[PDB]
Design a protein around this ligand. Structure first.
Ligand SMILES: *[C@@H](C)[C@H]1/C(=C/c2[nH]c(/C=C3N=C(/C=C4\NC(=O)C(CC)=C4C)C(C)=C\3CCC(=O)O)c(CCC(=O)O)c2C)NC(=O)[C@@H]1C
Ligand SMILES: *[C@@H](C)[C@H]1/C(=C/c2[nH]c(/C=C3N=C(/C=C4\NC(=O)C(CC)=C4C)C(C)=C\3CCC(=O)O)c(CCC(=O)O)c2C)NC(=O)[C@@H]1C
Length: 133
């Protein structure tokens, strides 16, 4: 009666995330090509190599969100305490939000998923964009 909407999306993301996560990655370091700089967020392939894990992680908990229904998994396992431990590491908040809008911008209904499926695929990416600010 409702599930199908969220369901389809999660599966869609499920079978194709490494291509959407990586996609976001490159774009993330496009708006902030200064992170590459020496002594910066992804200066070296080990701090830029793992930063990609953080993208699969946020999208990881989204498959789980649109399956249990709400933003339950995403929450505790990535909504608060993750953000001001970045403050501890000096991992900018605007950098994390750079992957999201791109992810949310790229969608398409006839080509990538569906009409109703998408507006909720963008509901948990925006639910995260808002949480990071
Ligand atoms: C409508 C938004 C605009 C449009 C889109 C467009 N998308 C691609 C290619 C990709 N975009 C995606 C996005 C996803 N794939 C998924 O399965 C999911 C589910 C989580 C999403 C939202 C990805 C990863 C790609 C690369 C792989 C692929 O071809 O599927 C293109 C191809 C050209 C390009 O990369 O720019 C296009 C045409 N076209 C417009 O210009 C629209 C306004
Ligand atoms: C691009 C987006 C940014 C980037 C990221 C970056 N990540 C870290 C360190 C951590 N990021 C996470 C994220 C999670 N860990 C979790 O446990 C969860 C929730 C279950 C998630 C989603 C965490 C917690 C850490 C820290 C501790 C650890 O080593 O595991 C780093 C490295 C840190 C350092 O002090 O060297 C990086 C590089 N880097 C960028 O360029 C961006 C701004």
């Amino acid at each position: 009666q409702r599930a199908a909407a969220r369901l389809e999306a999660a599966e869609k993301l499920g079978s194709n995330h490494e291509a959407v996560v990586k996609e976001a990655g490159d774009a993330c370091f496009s708006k902030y090509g200064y992170n590459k700089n020496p002594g910066e967020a992804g200066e070296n392939q080990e701090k830029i190599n793992k930063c990609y894990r953080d993208i699969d992680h946020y999208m990881r908990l989204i498959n789980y969100t649109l399956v249990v229904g709400g933003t339950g998994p995403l929450d505790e396992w990535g909504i608060a305490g993750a953000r001001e431990v970045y403050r501890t590491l000096n991992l900018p908040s605007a950098a994390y939000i750079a992957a999201f809008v791109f992810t949310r911008d790229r969608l398409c209904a006839p080509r990538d998923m569906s009409a109703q499926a998408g507006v909720e695929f963008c509901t948990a990416l925006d639910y995260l964009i808002n949480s990071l600010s």
